[PDB]
Each structure stands twice: as structure tokens, then as C-alpha cells.
Amino acid sequence: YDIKAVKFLLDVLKILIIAFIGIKFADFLIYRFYKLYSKSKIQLPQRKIDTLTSLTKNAVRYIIYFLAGASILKLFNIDMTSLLAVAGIGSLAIGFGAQNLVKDMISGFFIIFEDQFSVGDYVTINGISGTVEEIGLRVTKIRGFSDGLHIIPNGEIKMVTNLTKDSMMAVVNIAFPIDEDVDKIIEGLQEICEEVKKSREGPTVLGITDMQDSKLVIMVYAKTQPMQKWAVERDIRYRVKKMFDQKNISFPYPRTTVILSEKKT
Amino acid sequence: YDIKAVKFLLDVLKILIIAFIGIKFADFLIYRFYKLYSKSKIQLPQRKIDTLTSLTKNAVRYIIYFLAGASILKLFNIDMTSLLAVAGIGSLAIGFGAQNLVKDMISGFFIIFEDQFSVGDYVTINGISGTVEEIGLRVTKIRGFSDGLHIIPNGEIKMVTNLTKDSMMAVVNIAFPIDEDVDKIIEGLQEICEEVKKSRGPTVLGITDMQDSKLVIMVYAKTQPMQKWAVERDIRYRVKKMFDQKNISFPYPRTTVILSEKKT
Amino acid sequence: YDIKAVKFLLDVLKILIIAFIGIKFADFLIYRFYKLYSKSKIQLPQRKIDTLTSLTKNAVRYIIYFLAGASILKLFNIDMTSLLAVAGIGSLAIGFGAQNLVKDMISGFFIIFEDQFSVGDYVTINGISGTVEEIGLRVTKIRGFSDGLHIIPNGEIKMVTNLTKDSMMAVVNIAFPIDEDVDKIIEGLQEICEEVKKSRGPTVLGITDMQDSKLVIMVYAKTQPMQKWAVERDIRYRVKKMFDQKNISFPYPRTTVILSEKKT
Amino acid sequence: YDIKAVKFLLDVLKILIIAFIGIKFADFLIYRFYKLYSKSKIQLPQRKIDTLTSLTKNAVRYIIYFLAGASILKLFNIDMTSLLAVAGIGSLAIGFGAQNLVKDMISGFFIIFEDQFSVGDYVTINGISGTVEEIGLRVTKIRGFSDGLHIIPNGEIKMVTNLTKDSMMAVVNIAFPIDEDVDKIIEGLQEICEEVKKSRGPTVLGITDMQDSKLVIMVYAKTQPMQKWAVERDIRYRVKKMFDQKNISFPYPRTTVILSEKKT
Amino acid sequence: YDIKAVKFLLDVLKILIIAFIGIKFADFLIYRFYKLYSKSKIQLPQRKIDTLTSLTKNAVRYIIYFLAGASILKLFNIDMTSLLAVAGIGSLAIGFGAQNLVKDMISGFFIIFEDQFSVGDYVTINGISGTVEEIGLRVTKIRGFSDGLHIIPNGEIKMVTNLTKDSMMAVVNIAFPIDEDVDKIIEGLQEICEEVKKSRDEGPTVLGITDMQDSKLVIMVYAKTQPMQKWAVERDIRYRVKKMFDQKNISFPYPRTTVILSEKKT
Amino acid sequence: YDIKAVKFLLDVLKILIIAFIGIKFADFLIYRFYKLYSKSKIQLPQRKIDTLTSLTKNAVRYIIYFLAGASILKLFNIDMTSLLAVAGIGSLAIGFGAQNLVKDMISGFFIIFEDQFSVGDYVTINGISGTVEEIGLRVTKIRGFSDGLHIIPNGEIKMVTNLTKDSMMAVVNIAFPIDEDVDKIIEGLQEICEEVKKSRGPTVLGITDMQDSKLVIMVYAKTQPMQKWAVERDIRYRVKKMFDQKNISFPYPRTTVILSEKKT
Amino acid sequence: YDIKAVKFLLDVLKILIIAFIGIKFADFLIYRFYKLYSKSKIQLPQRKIDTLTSLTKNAVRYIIYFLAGASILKLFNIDMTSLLAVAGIGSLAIGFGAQNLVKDMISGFFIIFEDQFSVGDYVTINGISGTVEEIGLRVTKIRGFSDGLHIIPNGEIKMVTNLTKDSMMAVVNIAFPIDEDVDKIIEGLQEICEEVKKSRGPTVLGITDMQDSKLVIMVYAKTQPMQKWAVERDIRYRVKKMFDQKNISFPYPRTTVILSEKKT
Ligand SMILES: CCCCCCCCCCCCO[C@@H]1O[C@H](CO)[C@@H](O[C@H]2O[C@H](CO)[C@@H](O)[C@H](O)[C@H]2O)[C@H](O)[C@H]1O
């Protein structure tokens, strides 16, 4: 009948009493981390935080059941490495699945901690531009106009270009025919920058920026206060159109030279 | 004949009795997690949940068989690290295979918990736009019109743009010839915004783009959720008729050509 | 000469007898999992299931040989962590190789368990559309017409759009010249929807797009599963004939040219 | 001088004798797995299988040397976890490198075991089409005509579309001007299907697409494996001649131009 | 009643006292790594470094609670490998999540340590060009003109091309009609290089006809220019080429199409 | 003062003497693996193999220093798992870094062992075509003409299409106007195949494609390895001259225009 | 009060003294690996190597602090596997972060050791072409003309094509109208190769492509390293002048139009 059979009992006992203490203690701490976020009603409708509370309860129960079971099993001569080879299917699947969640959060943490963009400026993130409306630490929300509300997981942000930082820059690339008088148009554009400066950096006439088949491209650019940009550009375009009509300068219509051939069928 | 030969027996015994208790206990808990989801008939046809029940039964049997066998093997001087190097081929294959499933679920969990889109709005998810019909936590189902029902694993969602949140925005980019009177057309579009406001933006933002023979002015209006593409169509019809009445010429591509005196 | 030299023998002995029992037991269980799937001839030609039986036999032999060998090696003072560092080259290679297989299967499991598509509807899976012919749990087979039979491993399915669920939707985007009378054509299309309704939507949604010399009005109709592309063709024929009777001019591109006085 | 110094010797001894037994035994088994595949000359030129034999020899030598050395080191108080941290650089590098090889093989195993394609049909695998010439379990070889012999590692196969299964399908999309009589052409194509049926589908499916100046009607026919592109060519020749006899005008783009009075 | 029951107590005791010493010691070191970066006010508004301080506090509390708890559990016969199979879900999730952060940092470390680009030159990084404004070790900030301020995590930099190193190079590809006199234009461009050399900033030179197309012919002029002098030189050269085209009366590279006329109807 | 203090010394001693033996033995084996590859001067300039020799020396030194230090540390009550958590940063970094090297090598091993391409044929590997000049087992070198010498790591090879195996195939797709006599041209091409056969396929496969104003007939011929592009050029010249003699009109795009009476 | 309380002290003592010896010894070795690279001033400004020295100091301090702390913790009954689950968050993050660095270096090591390109030739690496200026083992620096200095981490090199190895190859694809005399132009190009050979290939390979209104003959020549793009320009100038003298008409697109009698 041996002498250990009592010690053994002390062992399965130790596991049971520790697991019990554990459950009750967890239920306590959870009911407290509950008490707080619940009684103040700072954020989060109840319907959700209840689902989240039972989420945590369930998680901790399953963990405790698993540890106590595994331990008792050890007590009956079951090999824990083999058990590891089973349980680790889930260590691996959950661990690697959750990695992305951790990524999003670290990402968000920096976005915020480094004030990459404040809860209101107009940015472009991953070829998607819009005005930032919300900045959680798992997701940034950005609504472009005409485009919808984009919800973007912070981890996916590979680069965030901010459009409205230390100001903004407006550009217009005007196109003329090379079959055209350069100095007259550069003069006209000069006069347009002149006039625009008069209604509240630039705007200036940078040289002929590109030379093409039948066209010739001169850009005007101006440094503008945050957001006044696309507006400035539209002002400038209207100005260029009217200037084209008054100075009677011919338009950049593509043109062909054609050679005729004497044949039939 | 030694003294351990009885202890040894106690050990292979301990494994067998614990694995037996284990099986019966699992059969019990499974027949209970069965009893519940089965007797209430809340969801899921039986034909399926039966397949799923035998799934869990089989899984638990294989796990138990493996643990008990491995343990007995240990009892006969078989090295458990080597065993691990065998069994882990499966730990790794299953573990990393299942990772994606875990991903889908965490994904869905947030989509729901963060009300990213309600079981009814019109969204666009990975270059695919449609009306959300179902939101499980493993899959979102979205049917675009003319396009079919799309079933998208929640994990694949890299971004979800919602089109019908705090409202919507309608745009029309009208194109004219530069060989054209700007103020007359901008005046006409002004009159069209005027008129459209009258039936329950819309505004004329400047010339937004300047091209070879064209010139492009956009009108835009903030619209209640979904009235959007509709507003746009209203505005288009209006612009067509306005073009006919004001007799403004159309944005046909215009080429200017030069003739050459040759032969062959 | 010591005292253990007998115990040692008991240990190498324990390994050998357990490995022997193991082999014979495995051969048994395999000859049984054989007996079943073999004597009923439910599926799978013999030539294959024989190759698959010897596959399982060989695997189990190699695993047993490896575990027994590794254990005996342990008995001669060979370090099992170093052995692990060797054997795990294969644990890793096989484990990560097989992960994909496990992926395909979980994937298939859901496709079926969730009736994503039945053994007969017309779906599109990864930019490839066709009629589903077979649905295993490792591979879906889909044959498009004119396109061949596609065998797609279930894991590769990133999204599966079903075209024939709660019905279908037919669209036709009719193109006119903007140099054209809108209301006459919209009237004609109205008459065509009218007439098509009469043979067992279809409706005129506004001008959906406005281009350089064109203008685009869509007609759309909700159709029973598969009657779709058919409806569309009916509607096209109708629109062509309507264009001929109403004598409406065709959406030919149009260019206005300006002539220039030069030479060479 | 102690009492263990003899036991220690028994231990370094045990390792040496086991490693020696191991080497000799491996050299034996290798010379046997050699004897077989060598004396029958079933496949593989000698020059190669020699290189492969010394490959196995060397592999086994290095593994044995490493295990014996590591074990002796353990005997001199060298920590085996630290050793693992060294040796695992190679465990990881080899393990993960070889993963792809394991992938190719599992992949090939299924391609074969599931008769996805027989050693002779015309398939398309990863946007590359051709006739399968060889099917190993690590590589499929496919030669398109005019295109060269493609050797594709089985693992890279993400999808395999078979073109010559339960038959084949031939299509021809005929293009007409919309400025054209529909029923005359549809009648002519009817007559062409009629005539083609007579030489050992083919049917006129409606107007499948409507474009700027064109209109597209497709004819299609179910054909025996490979007779396909051939049927299509027959049908094309027929359609050309039919165009010449029925004198129907060709689908040349057409543009309408407007002339403008200007200068420079 | 046994004899160990006192030793056991010594063990749970040992854990508790070590964990307590640990907490207090960490609070100390944290309050010191605090004292420094805080009292000098070298960088970082307080509002942030407070959030960061409580971050480190909380981290270390959770780690200590977990270690002590796990160790007591071990004391009550709880298997630590099974525990590992639970806790490693987090080992793996955090570890692999944080990998990217470590990447960014090693990346930045080299960018800086190798002076790949100084806090002022004009670079192009991942198809995105601009002037570098800030170089942290986690992020490079680059503002293109007309383009906005780009904040790029250092890890994402797969290649960094610098445009303003040992100088710069200006190019202009001039296009003519093949229906044209080559030597007259090559002569004119020669005269333009000549004249541009005369206004201050290697080149500019007339490299041969670099490309031949349907109705066009393309001759490039190029010049080595001091850092940033570049796009400017190019614009000078373009203006010069336009005016040269007007004076030398050379005809423009308009696309040209020969047409053949056909006698038909409908 | 205790009794172990001498045993302890025996332990740090055992580590030091084993590590010393280790170093000297490694220096030996390295100076031998040196002696061989060095005195025969089979390949590799000295300047390199010297750098490689000191590489191996240094590696082995660092490994030995680390093992012995780690072991002594263990002797002073330092925990080896925590050590592992440090040292494994490097285990992981080096192990996963080197994985690609192992990949390249296994890859090259098969390329060679399977004679996928001999040190001289013209292949295309990853959208890059050229003549193979060198085949190492870590890198294949291929020089296309006009294109430069490409050095490609063997691991990056996802597919290798060989162009010059069991021969080659030459294709020419001749384009005519549909506004054209089919049989006259097919006749002419017949005569060209006839004539080309006469100088040491080629055949007229039907009209392989039908387009807006064009019609495309292909001729194809099976040619000895490399004579291919050459054959094609022969055939093209032939087709041009045949076009000139048979006076057949060229496949110029043709557009029918409609004229409109307007202004501005 | 027990008997161990002194041994325990010996243990925490052992850790402290070994850690102290450890620190001092590391400070020494670091101050030596400092002494060398510092007093010779071979490379690296001081400002940097100082930052790098304190880097190594700090690294070693943190590792030592962590090992000693972990070990004392172990002494107070703290479980080391739990500790590992904590500390390995960093093992994994650092280990996998640094993997890329290890990759770059192995990569560079081969680039150099295999003289893939010398500190001076013109190469193209990942669709980016330029002259190599520097070759470190972590980064290759290449400056294209007009393009800037590219700094490329060696690990990112997937393929390196060298343009200036065993020489170079120059190509010019001349385009003519098919409406043209082939033999006259092929004759002229022959004369141009003739003349170019005269100033220190070049050959007329057949008509390499046949298009709608064009026809393309390539001339090619094998040229000394770098003389290539230059040769090509010579050849182009020659072809233009040859076109002017032989009066051959230019490859202008040509379109045949058909006129239609309509209105609006
Ligand atoms: C969760 C705790 C935090 C992570 C701690 C990581 C510290 C860094 C340690 C790197 C040591 C690498 O050393 C490596 O160990 C692993 C153990 O998984 C062994 O891996 C071996 O056994 C496993 C068992 O599951 C097999 O599935 C695997 O295929 C096989 O290679 C390698 O053969 C060995 O080379």
C-alpha cells in the first residue's frame, strides 16, 4: 500500500486548491477591472463591454482548466513534452495570428506619440488620401471627400505623407503649343502671378518644365497656408484660361502634319 | 526479479486509468456542449453540427491516444525529444496552417466590436464594393449589384472603406472645350446647382483640371446616405440639357493638322 | 564488472520489445484501416490505395526506426539536444512544407461546412470564373466554358464570389453620342424595357456616365439564376434594332479638326 | 585519484563504440541501398548516382561526427543548450531551406495521385500553357509549341487548368459594324454553323458585346480534345468568305469628324 | 504534519521577498532614468514622457507579477511547460510584432552611422523624392515640394538614392522630326552649349542622337552641375532650345502620318 | 572550506583542457583542408582562399570561446536558459539569414543533377533570356546578346524554360487586311513554305486571328536548335517580297469616316 | 536556522563575482578592440567609432546585468521557463529584426568573394543601372548618370546583371515602311556596317520584326567595354544620313481612310 499515496493526494490537492484560488482571484480582479470601466461610463456602450467581460472570463477559465488539467495529467505519468507538441498547435496558431494585432498597436502608439498627424489634418496614407477623423491606436479613420470613410489598421501603414504640415504648395502646369511665342505667354503668366499675389509665399513662374511633341510646359507654383492649396490652383487655372482668351494665345491642341499618297484599292 | 516491476505496473496503470477517465470525461463534456447547442435549435442544421460533433470527438480521441501512447513509450525508455522531433512535424503543420483561421477571427472580432460597418451599409473592401449582407466573425458577405455575392475571409481585409457613414458625397466632372466661353458655362452650372438644391451642396468648385483641348469643372454636393449616385445622375441629365439650350459646343477631341505635298 | 550491466540490458531490451510491439501493432491497424476502405470499394481505384497503404507503412516504419535508434543512442551517452539539432532539420522542413496542405484542408472544410457554393453553381474564384464541377476538401474544380477545367487548391482561395445565389443581375450600358436627343433614346429604351418585361426588371436607370463624345445610359434587370447573360443579349439585340428604327445616330468617336496652311 | 575516472572512461568509450558501430552500419546500409538501385540499372546514369551516393555518405559522416563530438563535449562539462544555440544556426538554415523541396514533393505527390493531368495532355499552369512531357514528383515539364520546354518546380503550381479533360470548347467572336444589318449576318453565321456541323456545336449565341462602332456576335462549339483551335480556324475562314459573298462591310473603326474654320 | 511545510514556506517567502525587492528596485531605477531625462528638459514635452514613464512602470509591474505568480504556481505543482504553451502565445505575438520596430531602428542606425544622407540634401527613397528635414533613427522625414511631408519608417527603406552627392547631372532630350536637317540642329545645340557655358555653373555638351523613332529623332544635351543647380540648368537649356527653334526656323517634332485615300461609300 | 572546491577546479579545468584540445585540433583540420585545396592550385586565386581560411579560423575561434565561456558561466550558477534567450538572438539572426544561401545551393544542386540546362544552351529564366555561360551551384550566369551578363542566385529560379532542348520552333504571324483575297495570300504562303523547305516545317496553319481591319495567318516550322529566329527572318523577307510580287495590299489600319456639317 | 544559508550565500556570491570578472574582462577586451582600430586611424572618423564603442559597452552591460539578475532570481525560486517567455519577446524581436542585416552581409560577402562586379564597371541591379562606385559588404553604391547615387543594401540584390564583362553588344533597330524597297535599304545598311568597321561587328541581321505599316531590321556589333551606346549613336547618325542620300521614305505611320456620305 506504500507511503506516497498520501503525498500524491497532497499533490493533486495542491493543484486543485491553487486552481480554485486562481479562479476566484481572477473572477475578483475581472469584476474590479469591470467595476471601474463600468461605473464611470467613460466610453463603450454596455452591450459591448459585457461581451468583452465574458470574453476575459472565458479566456481565464480555459487557461486555468488547461493548466490544472495538464498538471494532474503530469501527476499520472503523462509526458509534458508530448503534451507541449499538442497544446503548441494552439500556442503557434494563436501566437502568430495575434502578432498582427500587436503590430497595429505598436504602429498606432508611434503615430500618436510622435504626432505624425493630429485629429484633423488632411493626409495621404497608402495611396489613399483624406481628412483624419479618428485616431485610435489600432486603427486610423480617414474620410476623403467623394470617397467614403476609410478604416485603416495602423499596422498596414507603410508610410504616411502629411499634406498640411508646415504649410502647403500649389502647382499648375500650363501647356502651350511649341508652335507659339514663349515670351508673350511667360509675360502673361508673370502678370497673373502679379495679380494673384494681390488676394490673400508665391505665386511664381518657374521656367519651361517640360518639352514635348507639339507642347511646351511651364509651371507656376505658390506656397500656401494649410488647405488654401487646391483652391489657389483653381484660381490660377481660371486666370490662365481668361489670359489665353485675352492675349489670344492659341491652345495646346495636339496637331499632326500629314502627307498624302496617291493610291487606290 | 527486482522490486520496481510492481511500481512500473503502477505507472503504465496510472497512464491507462487517467486516459480512460479522460476519454469518458471528454465524451461527457462533448455530449453536453452537444446537449445545449442541439436541444435549443438556435442555429445550424443538424446534418452539420453532427459532422462537427464527430469532428470534436475524433480530435479528442486522437489527442488522448497520442498522449497515452507517447507516455507509455516514455516508460519503455523511448526518448521524448526525439519523439518531439517526430510529433512536431504535425505541431508545426497544423499550428501554422490554423494561424490564418485565428487571423480571420481576430479580424472579424474587431470589425464587429468596432462597428466598422453595420449589417446593411454599402462599403468597399479590397477594391470590391457592395452592400454588406452578412457579418460573421470569420467571413464578411457583401453583394454588389450586377456583381454577385462576395464571401471574404475577415483576415484578408487590409482596409475597409465605408461609403455610407456620416453621409456621402456626390461629384460630377463636367468637361468643356478650352476653345470655349468659360463664364457662360460656369454660369449655367451655377443655375443647375441652384435648381437642384430645389429638390430634396450642390456647388460649382472651380476648373479642377486643364487638358489638351478640354477644361474640367467639377460640381459636388453632400448627400444623405445612398442618395449619391442618384444626385450625380440628376446633375448629368441637367448638364446635357443645359448644353443643348445654352448651345455650348461639346468637348470633342480637336486636332489641328498640317498638309504636306508628297507622293509615293 | 559492476551491477548495472544487467539493468542496461533491460533498457535496450525495453526499447526493442516496445518498438517490436509497436511495429506489429501499426501493421495491424494499417491492415485494418486497409480492410475497411478496401473491401467496400467505395472510392479510389486499387492501384492508388495500394501506393497509399505502402506510403503509411513506410512512414510508420521510418518513425519507429528513428525513435528506437534515437533512444538506444541516448543509452550510449549520445546527447539528445544535439540529436534534436540534427533531426529537427527534418522536423522543420516537413512541418513547414506540410503547412500548406493543412491550409488547403481547413479552407475546404469551411467552403463545404458553410455551403459557400453547391456542386453546381457558377462562381468566380480569384479572377477565374466557371461552373463548379467537383468540391473536394483539398481542391475545388471549376470549368469555365471555352476556358478549360481549373483545379484550384482550396488554400489559394482568397475570396469566392458566387454569381448565382439569391438570383442574378443583368446590365447593359448603352452608349450614344452627346450630339444626340436624350429623351427620344431614353423613351425608346423605356419601350424596350416595356417589351422585354413581356417575355419570361428591366428598367432605365439614368445617364450613368458622361464622356468626350459619348453619353452612357444603363438598363438593368433582376433575373433568375443564369438567365442573366441571356437577358443582356436579348436587350442588346433590342437596342440595335431600336437604333435602326428610331434612326438614332451611332456613338462613333467624333473629332473636330482645324486646318493649317503650311508646307515642307 | 577518485573512483569515477574509470566510469568516465566507460562513457567516452560508450560514445566511441556506438559511433563506430553507427558508421560501419551506415556504410553498410548505404552500400545496400546502393547495391539495389545500382545493379538493376533501372534509371539514372552512373556518374550521377555515384555523386548521390557520396552525398549520402558524407551527410551521414558529418552527422555522426557531430553527434559523437557534441556528446564527448557534454562529457567535459560543455553546456548543450549553448551548443544548441550554435548548431541550431544550421538546424534553422538547412531546415527552412529544405522546406521548399518538401513542398515541391508534396505538391507533385498530389498532382500524380489525383491524376490532375496525364503524361500527354495540353494544360496551362501559371499563365504558361503547353503539352506535358514529363511528370516527376519534384518537377513538371511542359513544352508549348513555339515556346520552349518549361521545367516548373511542383511547389510553384498555384493552380493547374487542364484544357483537354472531358473535351474542349471552341469560340470565335465575330465583329461587325453597328452600321450594319444584324439579321443578315446572324443568318449567314447560322448557315456557317449549319455547314461546319457537316464535317467531323457549332451554334450562334446572341450579340455578346456592343461597342462604339462595332457589335460582337460569338459562335461556339463543343469539340473533341484538341480539335479546338482547329475548329476555330475553320470557322474564321468560313466567316471571311461569308463576308466576301454576302458583301457585308468590315468592322473598320469609324470616326465622324467635324470641320472648323481657322488658321494660324 | 511533515518537515517540509517550513521549507515550502521559505520558498513562497523567497519568491515574495525577491519580487518585492524587484518592484522597489525597478521603481527606483525608473524614477532615476526619470530624474535625468526629466530635470534637464533636453527634448520631449512632459505630457509625453509622463505617458512613457507610466508605460515602463506598467510593463515592469506586469512582468514581475507574471514571474512571481508563475513561480508560486510552480510551487503548487503546476507544470511550467504547459504554462509556457499559454504564456508563449504572448511571447510570440509581442516578439514578432516588435520585430518591425527593431528593424526600423537598425536601419536608421546605419542610415545615420554611414551618412547616407545629411539633414538637408534632396533624396529619393522608394519612388518618393523630397528634401530631408528630419532624421530620427526610427523614421526619416522628407518633404517634396508640392507634395507634402512624408514620414517614412526607416525599415521600409529598400534603397535610398541620393540626388545631391558628389554633385548633380542635368539632361535635356531634344526631339526633332526625322524629316529634318540633322547638322543644322546639332550645330544650333552646339551654339547653345557654348552660350550656356558662359553663365555660372562641367558641361553642357551635345551627345549624339540618342534615339530614333517613327517621325522623331532625339538628341540629348547634358551638363554636370553643382548640387541643386540641375533642374534649373535644364530649364535654361529648354528656353534656349525653343528660341533657337524659332530663330533657326527649324520645324517642330509634330507627329506626322501619311494617309492614303479610298474610294467607297455606305 | 568544504570538499568540492577541488572537484569544482576539476570542472573549470575539464572545460579549459577540452577547449584547448578543441582549438588546436581545429587549427589542424583547417590547416589540412587548407593544405589540400591550396597545394594543388585547382581553382580560386590565393588572395581569396586566404580570406576564406581566416574566415573559418575566426568562426571556429568564436564558437569555441563562446562554448567554453558559456560553460564556465554555468559553473558559476548562471542560468543557461536565460543565456539561450540572449545567444539565440544570434542563433535566429544568422540561421534565418543563411537560410537563403542553403536555398540557392539545394536549387543549384538540382539544376545540375537534373541537367536542366547544359553549360551552353540558350534558356530563359524569370523573364530573362540568354546563353548560359557558367553554372555554379550557388549562381547561374547567363548572357543575353545586347543585354549583358546576368548573375542569378539559383534560389531565385522559380521556373527555367529551356529554348533549345529536343529542338526548336519558328513562328511568323503574317497580317493582311480583311479587305483582301484570302486564298491568293494563303496560296502565296504555301509557295513560300514550299521554297523554304528547299534550303537546309514550314507550314501554313489556318487564319489564327481575326481583328478589326486585319486577319492573321501563321506559318510555323520545326527547326534544329538555334536555327530558329534565323528561319523566321528568312520567312519574313520571303513574305515581304511575296507581297510585292503578288501585289497584295498591306495591313494598314483602316478607318471609315463620316462627315458632319457644323462650325463654331 | 539550517545549514544551507551559507551555501546559498556562496551561490549569490558566485554569481556576483563571475559577473564582476565578466564586466571588467569585457571592458578590457573592448578597450583593446578599441586600442587597435583607434590608434592606427585606418578608417572611420572618431566621432563615429566612439558612438560604436559605447554601443558595444552598453550592449555587454545590459547582457551581463540580465544574466546575473536572471540567475539570482533563479536562486529565489523564480521559474526560468516563465522568465524565458518574458525575455524571449526580445530574443524574437531582436533576432528576427537583425536577420536582415545578416542577409545583407552574406550577400555582400558573395558579391565580393565571387567578383560579381569590380569597383568600377557599369552594372544594372534591380531595374536600376549605374556605375559602381563603392562595394561594402553591407551596401553597394552605384551612380547612374543623370540619376543620382543609389545606395542598395546587398540583401535586396535579387539579381545583378553586369553590362561590361567579357565585352559588350550594340544594337540598332532600324524601322522602314513596308511600303518600301527592302533590298535597297538592306544594301545601304550593308554599306554603313562596311564604313563603321573602318573606325576603331557591325552586321545586318535580317528583318527582325514585321508590323502594320513598318518593317524592322536590326544591325548589331560586338564592342569593347563601354564603347557600346557610342557605337549605337554613330550608327544612328549614319542611318539618318543614309536615309537622306538614298532618299528612302520615313516610317511614318500610315492609315488608309474611307469616306462616308452623311450629315447630322
Ligand atoms: C517562447 C519563448 C521565447 C522564444 C525563445 C527563443 C530564443 C532563441 C532560441 C533559438 C534556438 C534555435 O535552436 C533550434 O531550436 C529548435 C527548437 O524549437 C529546434 O527545432 C527542432 O525541434 C522542433 C520541435 O518542435 C521541431 O519542430 C523543429 O522542426 C526542429 O528543428 C532546432 O533543431 C534548433 O536548431
Ligand SMILES: CCCCCCCCCCCCO[C@@H]1O[C@H](CO)[C@@H](O[C@H]2O[C@H](CO)[C@@H](O)[C@H](O)[C@H]2O)[C@H](O)[C@H]1O
Ligand atoms: C547578429 C546579431 C545582430 C544584432 C544586431 C544588434 C541590434 C542593435 C542595432 C543598433 C541599435 C541602435 O543603436 C542605438 O544607438 C543609440 C545612440 O545613437 C544608443 O544609445 C546609447 O547612448 C545613449 C546616449 O545618447 C544612451 O541614452 C543609451 O543609454 C545608450 O544605449 C541606443 O541605445 C541604441 O539602440
